[PDB]
């Protein structure tokens, strides 16, 4: 965030001079990433049982 | 040390100006070549 402040009145002082601030961003990201299994099983086993 | 920034302090400034030339005519007349029209009172310098 910037940041305000008060003044004051001169032509001569370091006050009556306004402060210079900064707004600022950042960057965020998603990454996608992959998540996976493999289950293997024998053929006779799938033949063989009662249910899918 | 003498720098006013004007934004920066909230001020403004009024800058006046004009340009002027003068010119005298040291010129002929009937009397001669180079006539001077203005003559002055000096002021008193004796010590009475």
Do not use: C, H
Not at chain 2, 2 to 25: C, T
């Amino acid at each position: 965030l910037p940041e305000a402040d008060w003044v004051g009145e001169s032509a001569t002082d370091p006050e009556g001079v306004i402060k210079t601030s900064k707004v600022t961003w950042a960057n965020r990201t998603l990454v996608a990433e992959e998540v996976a299994v493999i289950i293997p099983v024998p053929e006779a086993v799938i033949d063989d049982a009662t249910v899918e | 040390d003498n720098q006013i920034n004007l934004a920066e302090r909230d001020m403004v400034a009024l800058r006046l100006k004009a340009r002027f030339a003068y010119v005298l005519g040291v010129s002929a007349t009937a009397m001669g070549a180079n006539k001077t029209p203005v003559g002055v009172v000096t002021p008193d310098v004796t010590p009475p």
